[PDB]
């Protein structure tokens, strides 16, 4: 009948953490329709408010104060996008009240900002400290490093870490610093499942998470969906949002108690994260979170500066080298023997584990013998002969039946004259063996229901099972650097 | 190793600007040894905060009591760069001091906040608005002009303006707002040596500037030179900067008394500028000109992507154009048919009055008959026969004595195949231009006790220029789709 079905293999990298319909209960959720009508609420309301919002009706100055009504009517009254936030006492004491609005719904949420005062909230000046710091380092490495470090200062989290996302979307523990009695976490590795597409989407729309108590209860809203839409109420952009029981079972694991996040972004990706955890609750006042959001915007520009000005001197420098390449085969008796030479040839533009270069049935072996792999290389792409370049990290490497076998599964490889069998290749072994440097972590534990991969060693054992096999990858600039060198080569091709 | 020192282009790029050993009197500079010993101060401290500050004596708390050393002394035993500001009130002024370290020196500036409103020059709420507002702009032009507003409204300034630069450093005022009776700029030129080379890497490095009065007498910073090294302090990063004589004689011309602009980078690169002017002296608190640092970079990041995804288009559909033309060519009995007729053809491909196709000994002519040009052209490229793409927007015309003269400014040419004398060739025809220059750009010079004095301009008076013999300048993406059809050609002429 139905003759079709979803994808539906995974258990919960497709659980939805954008719609849960839930809240922190350190806050209360207010919902409205967009003329103003409330249509669902928090129901610890009342616990904080000392009102119910009534579903169908609309707030009062007797509730919320004219304060909060500025906002709100002045954010009904406009149009696109809206967030604010403004400051009141709410019965005996002191509330936040934050809001926003996204695909037509206005949203309302409270945060408890009491027993805290305007001295704790010096901090706003160690976060602008933090924000002038920032602008004047010189690379992501100490970047990282310093705000790792000084994140802690400031706030008191337990640990911090910067996180750093390779190509692959798996994601690295570049720096940490941490109270000293708790186990470093510096240099695990973890594979791309570990941030679901859709947490990847929201730390990259949204630039700051916010976990008070992995132990709280979850506020149900209701009611649970907007009559208007028949559909759930989009909180992506809120703050007070259930966090999903999976990752609160991976902290509990951990023995985290309260987390905080600042999103880097760069080129639209979710380049990096600082994570910040304490081992017992922990809340941050919402005007704070402000400063870290502007931080995350700013820090966010700066690494995205710095990544662009190291790509452009890894283009320059191969440029400035192709072209001397270029001009040696021009000016020598010989292309291929100026292809060859280990002084200067293919050996040199790309990082490799060797390279062979073809041409006009001649073969040479630069740093070892390929011969096996380029003819196997050229016996798949005889399948396919309109292909120009091929590469590949993950090549079935030869078989150990015979000594033919070894280690290149990474294959980068040029037709540069089709007319006469020219190839140049380039090779590359397995990459694990280079970086097996991670510390298996062994924290002693009674496990959560889901067991043990929902802990670091679990996440470091399933990012090697990601890597096996896999070369070092083929950088853009590796490809690019293939690229130009094809069309320099096709040039002798065409003059002799 | 050189045993030769590089010889700069133009007296225009030799002020230092960096180390003018004087500051604007709106405030003081105290300098200090990196265990915090003074190395050099102000004239000025003693009539602005009580005391005088010897150097090898320390600040002591008696002088600027304890907010200050606490900053400063959390500075020294700092790692890496410092920088960070306090509020705090000496003698009866309201300070703002504002700290950092640059090249290991350390500063400590001193702002009187005097006489303006505690509340609204809130740092946070400040760049809440401006940030709020650059991120709803879907291009650089509306993001010029809103953004040209805003400034206007939160500054009170009497002009502001959106700066641009063009492809020979030259640049022009693209977006404006003023005071009702005050003249309009809008749309006029300015030369490239207006903003000299060394004065835009500075302001790639420092992203802002402030002038509190252009009529300032400098307060020279005694001792000149730091006795570590006897060399200049370095002040490119100071807020107090003393500000170029010629450009407050450049601000005085055009009557302004007040200067404040914001520095747009891209790729690296000086972009275009913020800048505001008043007709009264004006001073910003340093709260407010923190929040347009913090926005600079958040403008530059936006302004980087939304210019990228604009050339990145133009480039994704002239690639499209190339290889459809690639496979035209490709698919035909003759390269030089499919190359010549308006179903897409050479002519397609850039914007062009004409063009010409010739390999073998054929030509062919498009959109006219250009035999006499294409002949005349590679006549003279037997003068430097080793080129292979040539291009002008000013080939110098015949005489006047007959319209048989080769009169078309524009030409641009590709030698696709040396061996077959393979060219093509694009053309333009004159195309009448007019430039308001802000001001007649007259010689930069007088001559007076100083010598010759790079003077700017007598006046600001809209001149206009009317540019004749030139065509359409070829774009960069213009000849870079000539040079990736000159590959794509030898590669065809290669198998041809
Ligand atoms: C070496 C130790 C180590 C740690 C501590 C580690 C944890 C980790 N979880 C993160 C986030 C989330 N993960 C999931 C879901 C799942 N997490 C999985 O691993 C799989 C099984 C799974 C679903 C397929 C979700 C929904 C979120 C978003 C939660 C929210 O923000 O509401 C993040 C980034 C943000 C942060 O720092 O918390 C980190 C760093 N990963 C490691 O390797
Ligand atoms: C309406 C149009 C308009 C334009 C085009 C404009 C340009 C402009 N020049 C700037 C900087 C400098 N220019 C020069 C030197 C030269 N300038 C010239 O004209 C010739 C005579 C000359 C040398 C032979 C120097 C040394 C500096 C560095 C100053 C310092 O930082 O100490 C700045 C930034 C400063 C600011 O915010 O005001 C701007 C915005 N200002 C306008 O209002």
Chains 1, 2 share one sequence.
């Not at 590795?189 to 709280?216: F, K």
Request: aromatic share 8%.
């Amino acid at each position: 009948m139905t003759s079709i079905t979803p994808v539906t293999l995974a258990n919960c990298e497709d659980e939805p953490i954008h719609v849960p319909g839930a809240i922190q209960p350190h806050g209360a959720l207010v919902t409205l329709r967009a003329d103003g009508m409330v249509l669902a609420a928090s129901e610890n309301i009342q616990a904080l408010l000392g009102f119910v919002a009534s579903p169908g009706s609309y707030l009062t100055q007797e509730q919320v104060g004219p304060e909060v009504l500025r906002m709100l009517e002045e954010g009904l009254t406009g149009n696109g996008p809206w967030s604010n936030s403004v400051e009141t006492r709410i019965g005996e004491h002191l509330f936040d009240v934050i809001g926003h609005s996204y695909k037509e719904v206005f949203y309302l949420e409270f945060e408890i900002r009491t027993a805290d005062t305007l001295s704790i909230t010096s901090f706003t000046l160690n976060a602008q400290r933090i924000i002038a710091q920032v602008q004047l380092h010189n690379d992501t490495a100490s970047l990282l490093s310093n705000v790792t470090d000084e994140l802690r200062r400031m706030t008191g989290y337990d640990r911090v870490m910067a996180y750093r996302f390779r190509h692959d979307d798996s994601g690295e523990v570049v720096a940490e610093s941490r109270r000293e009695d708790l186990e470093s976490y510096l240099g695990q590795r973890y594979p791309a499942s570990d941030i679901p597409a859709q947490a990847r989407r929201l730390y990259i729309q949204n630039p700051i998470r916010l976990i008070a108590d992995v132990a709280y209860t979850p506020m149900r809203v209701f009611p649970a969906l907007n009559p208007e839409t028949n559909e759930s109420f989009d909180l992506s952009y809120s703050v007070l949002r259930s966090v999903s029981p999976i990752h609160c079972e991976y902290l509990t694991n951990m023995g985290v108690r309260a987390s905080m996040s600042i999103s880097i972004v760069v080129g639209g990706k979710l380049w990096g994260l600082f994570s910040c955890h304490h081992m017992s609750p922990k809340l941050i006042p919402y005007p704070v979170r402000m400063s870290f959001q502007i931080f995350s915007q700013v820090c966010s520009a700066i690494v995205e500066r710095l990544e662009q000005g190291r790509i452009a001197e890894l283009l320059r420098v191969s440029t400035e080298r192709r072209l001397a390449l270029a001009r040696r085969a021009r000016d020598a008796d010989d292309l291929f023997g100026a292809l060859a030479h280990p002084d200067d040839g293919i050996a040199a533009l790309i990082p490799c584990d060797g390279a062979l270069v073809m041409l006009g049935g001649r073969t040479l072996s630069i740093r070892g013998d390929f011969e096996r792999q380029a003819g196997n290389v050229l016996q798949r792409l005889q399948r396919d002969p309109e292909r120009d370049i091929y590469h590949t990290d993950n090549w079935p490497q030869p078989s150990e039946d015979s000594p033919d076998g070894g280690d290149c599964c990474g294959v980068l490889a040029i037709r540069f004259h089709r007319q006469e069998s020219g190839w140049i290749f380039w090779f590359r072994h397995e990459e694990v063996h280079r970086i097996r440097w991670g510390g298996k972590p062994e924290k002693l534990l009674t496990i959560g229901p889901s067991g043990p991969r929902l802990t670091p060693r679990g996440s470091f054992e399933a990012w090697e099972e990601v890597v096996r096999g896999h070369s070092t990858p083929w950088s853009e600039t590796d490809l690019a650097i293939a690229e130009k060198l094809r069309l320099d080569l096709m040039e002798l091709c065409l003059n002799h």
